Amino acid sequence: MPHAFKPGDLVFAKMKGYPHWPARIDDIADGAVKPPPNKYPIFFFGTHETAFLGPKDLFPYDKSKDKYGKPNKRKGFNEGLWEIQNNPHASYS
């Protein structure tokens, strides 16, 4: 059975106006800004942007890739697909 989300989990993350996007749950570094309650730090592959999202917008990558893991015209998307498949836990700083 599923656990709660934890840092390192791979997802497609949904934001308004954008397709479901390859992403991961990030760690929060010591000294770094914490997310609001009930929110997770989401690092978006390809764009390398961070947003704070709740579970309603988080789709586990393995279950969802057949539906959401197809090339898309949007800036950063295809790079993001390579990242999540090939080095999802790397430093992208």
| Count of strand segments | 5
Helix content: 10-25%
Principal-axis shape: globular
**If strands are numbered along the chain, what order do they take across the biggest sheet?**
4-3-2-1-5
Q: Which class do the helix and strand fractions yield?
A: alpha+beta
Q: How widely separated are the two ends?
A: 33 Å
Largest sheet: 5 strands, antiparallel
Tally of individual helices: 2
Proportion in β-strands:
15-25%
Radius of gyration: 13 Å
Q: In CATH, what is the class of the domain at 10-29 and 38-77?
A: Mainly Beta
- What is the CATH T-level topology of the domain at 10-29 and 38-77? SH3 type barrels
What is the level-2 CATH architecture name of the domain at 10-29 and 38-77?
Roll
> Secondary-structure element order, as H and E?
EEEEEHH
PDB class: gene regulation
Keywords: Inhibitor, Fragment screening, Epigenetic reader, methyllysine, pwwp, Diamond Light Source, I04-1, PanDDA, XChem, gene regulation
Assembly: monomeric
Entry title: PanDDA analysis group deposition -- Crystal structure of HRP-2 PWWP domain in complex with Z54633859
